[PDB]
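seq:
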Amino acid sequence: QNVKGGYWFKDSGLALNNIDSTLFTHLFCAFADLNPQLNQLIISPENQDSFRQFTSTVQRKNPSVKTFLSIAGGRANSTAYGIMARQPNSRKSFIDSSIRLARQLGFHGLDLDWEYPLSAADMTNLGTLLNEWRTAINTEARNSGRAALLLTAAVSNSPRVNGLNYPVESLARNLDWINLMAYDFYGPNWSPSQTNSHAQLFDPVNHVSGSDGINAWIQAGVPTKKLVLGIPFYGYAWRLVNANIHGLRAPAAGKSNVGAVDDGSMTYNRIRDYIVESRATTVYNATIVGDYCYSGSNWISYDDTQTVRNKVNYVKGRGLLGYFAWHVAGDQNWGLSRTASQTWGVSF
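struct:
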């Protein structure tokens, strides 16, 4: 089976019951948290009610959809995970609790989104964690007579992140697949001084791209059939220094007030509305495979229909396992989700 993946989180505003699970093969419920006292996977009080109903609810619209409990994410305390991974006892309590929790709530898989291990030692310990997690998953399957839980991880676009190599052999051996975060390459909260496509498939300038990411993972020894390409249903708004200069790499002054206060982010649906209301000029750039729009001193990078279609065709043609979307609520009336699914076509 190929992967048509989608991430959801409660604070996205999309009701659990309104996720169109017909457009996906796998849905990721984000995020479960690490209790640093117990070194166990838990679900926060705020997430409890929805997470407990996640699987049964989404299966009402599509009984064949499979679900993952996603772990950690961008807002998690990385040092807590480093501590957990440091010792066999804390790895075991984490592993055992994750398996129990997945089974209890009906999840068919666990997805580790540790963003990111802080040192080379942490990366090594992640490798060890995955070795032990796989063994425990296989053992639980053998003892219960049930099909094994799936185990995946969301990882950076490149297997080298913040100057640190992932434990690529362990990832390749132990995971059913990796979810490649082929987005957030650039953003006004970290690269404020020029515009850029945050998710470009190609990059002849600096080779910071989804295709270059895929290639780096392949070169690192991870098989093509264990790669799932991330596609963003959101973008970022920069403030242009000069409204007349509005291409890629245009001088900028950080985040635009049309985007989120913290990072300038905007869901795809918000961007689409903005384009209509502002009469923004839109550009599909065929070289990079990415979209942007501009109006006055506002400039926004995102993926629209043509980009999504082209990315999906590209990874299908290259024999990757599939794609996933971060995140489903960002779509405009399921437009990009449907484009992606129908472009891929038959899911096996």
